[PDB]
């Protein structure tokens, strides 16, 4: 009926599942990776790679040094550590939790290479924000056409990694042509640093959760969800940063976390620019991204779809599955599960959009289709470069469960890392 905001923090905390110990997560049934790499049981794989994985969080995800150690990737299980311990070189990148995909891609570039974020003169002028952002040391500084990586992005992270791959490969005409000093190499094109792009629970065609909500309310709701993890009091402690430096929205000297959050929530940013996550998450905004962010011909693309709704036999609406769906997502799942729209200049939303994972419509997750020329095929026991390999649906699994909040997923990720290591070179 009603999506809660911070006004309803008490009821959210009340309805929420308790955070579990690592021991208790390990007692849950492990998620099973569904396939073997093609031909592994018919012949020798001879063309594999040693490229590392870089993990990229979604909307309202935070870094390894935030949330008092609770990890985006695995929660109380440190998936990065487990992957490295089992021989799968893995890093974690951290970008703006509520910034646009463009801004996040520029941040991701700097996070990997090292240096100061550069959003582009042209872009920064157009959207009226700073050209330069924060400074990072670099987690994989030697990245190159020879030293490629596998990008894995959850939620909005999947849009962000598509966007980085587009910019690396083809650059930005607007940036190239504006005649700025010391253009970021990101915008020049010609870089083939990415071997694969994997999206997990990604709004590749947006999510109608953004369409149906006022932006401020969506953000406020998501602070509520964060609170179910941090605890309602620790939610207002200095254990996370919204990273809106470019907008002049850093926490002020002497400002409390609570005052900082209220100030950001009350900002004009949420209804006054398209250069923000809430726009980029909407179906209109995702469609716009899709009109220029294409699947590159020399990169493997994989998509994973989560679902935790069932169809109501009475109305045809999709509703939360009791058990699999976090109770915090009951209202979001149920509103998306009955949201239609047939309005000029906007994507037509019909019953195919109803099934969801609490946050993102299932139909949106297999790859970009709105405004896209990308090819999508369901995985058929062979991998195809330059197009989307839409992998077997991850049913009975909500939006956060697939990153360990809450689920036993470490073996799935280790098996996926093994799978990715078999991928052979572009011809
Ligand atoms: K909206
Ligand atoms: K769940
Ligand atoms: Zn921007």
Separation of alpha carbons 350 and 342, rounded Å: 8
Query: Which pair of structure tokens corresponds to residue 278?
Result: 């809430």
Query: Which pair of structure tokens corresponds to residue 247?
Result: 């907008």
> Is 155 tagged catalytic?
yes
As to burial, measured by CB atoms within 10 angstroms (0-12 exposed, 13-18 middle, 19+ buried), residue 188 is middle
> Which residue in 217, 357, 398, 401 is the catalytic one?
357
The experimental technique used to determine this model is X-ray
Own/partner pairs, 110-113, CB within 8 angstroms, 24+ separation: 110/135, 110/136, 110/138, 111/136, 111/138, 111/139, 112/54, 112/138, 112/139, 112/140, 112/141, 112/143, 112/149, 113/138, 113/140, 113/141, 113/143
> Which residue in 201, 205, 399, 421 is the catalytic one?
399
> Is 192 tagged catalytic?
no
> Is 205 tagged catalytic?
no
DSSP per-residue string spanning 171-197? --HHHHHTT-TT--GGGG-----EEEE
**What CATH number belongs to 6-422?**
3.40.50.1820
**Residues 6 or more apart in contact with residue 139 via CB below 8 angstroms:** 54, 91, 92, 93, 111, 112
Supply the DSSP symbol for 353: G
Helical H segments across 183-256, by residue range: 208-212, 215-230
Strands 388-390 and 376-378: what pairing? parallel
C-alpha of residue 211 to centroid of ligand 1, in Å? 4
Query: Which pair of structure tokens corresponds to residue 229?
Result: 């993890």
Q: What is the resolution of this structure in A?
A: 1.2
**Which ligand places an atom closest to the C-alpha of 218?**
1
- The domain limits of the chain are 6-422
């Amino acid at each position: 009926i009603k999506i809660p905001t911070l006004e309803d923090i008490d009821n959210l905390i009340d309805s929420a599942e308790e955070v579990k110990s690592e021991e208790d997560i390990n007692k849950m049934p492990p998620l099973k990776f569904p396939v073997e790499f093609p031909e592994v049981n018919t012949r020798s794989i001879i063309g594999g790679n040693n490229y590392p994985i870089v993990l990229v969080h979604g909307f309202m995800g935070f870094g390894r040094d935030e949330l008092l150690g609770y990890k985006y990737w695995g929660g109380v299980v440190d998936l990065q550590e487990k992957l490295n311990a089992s021989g799968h070189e893995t890093y974690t990148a951290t970008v703006g939790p509520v910034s646009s995909n463009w801004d996040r891609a520029c941040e991701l570039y700097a996070y990997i290479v090292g240096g100061t974020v550069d959003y582009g003169e042209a872009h920064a002028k157009k959207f009226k924000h700073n050209r330069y952002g924060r400074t990072y040391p670099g987690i994989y500084k030697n990245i190159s056409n020879e030293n490629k990586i596998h990008l894995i992005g959850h939620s909005m992270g999947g849009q962000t990694i598509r966007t980085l791959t587009q910019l690396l490969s083809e650059g930005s005409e607007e940036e190239i042509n504006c005649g700025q000093e010391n253009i970021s190499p990101l915008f020049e094109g010609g870089k083939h640093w990415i071997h694969s792009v994997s999206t997990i629970s990604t709004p590749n065609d947006g999510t109608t959760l953004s369409d149906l909500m006022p932006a401020k309310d969506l953000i406020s709701y998501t602070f509520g969800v964060l609170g179910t993890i941090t605890g309602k009091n620790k939610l207002f402690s200095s254990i996370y940063d919204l990273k809106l430096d470019q907008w002049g929205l850093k926490k002020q000297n002497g400002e409390s976390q609570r005052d900082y959050i209220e100030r950001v929530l009350d900002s004009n940013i949420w209804n006054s620019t398209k250069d923000i996550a809430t726009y980029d998450l909407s179906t209109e905004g995702a469609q716009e991204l899709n009109t220029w962010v294409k699947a590159q011909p020399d990169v493997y693309y994989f998509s994973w779809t989560t679902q935790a709704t069932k169809e109501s036999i009475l109305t045809g609406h999709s509703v939360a599955q009791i058990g699999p769906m976090n109770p915090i997502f009951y209202p979001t799942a149920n509103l998306m599960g009955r949201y239609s729209r047939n309005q000029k200049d906007l994507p037509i939303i019909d019953k195919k959009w109803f099934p969801n994972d609490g946050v993102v419509n299932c139909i949106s997750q297999d790859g970009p289709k709105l405004g896209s020329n990308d090819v999508i095929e369901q995985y058929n026991g062979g991998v195809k470069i330059g197009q989307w390999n839409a992998m077997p649906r991850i049913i009975n699994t909500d939006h956060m469960d697939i990153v360990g909040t809450f689920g036993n997923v470490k073996d799935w990720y280790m098996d996926y890392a093994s799978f990715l290591s078999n991928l052979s070179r572009a011809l």
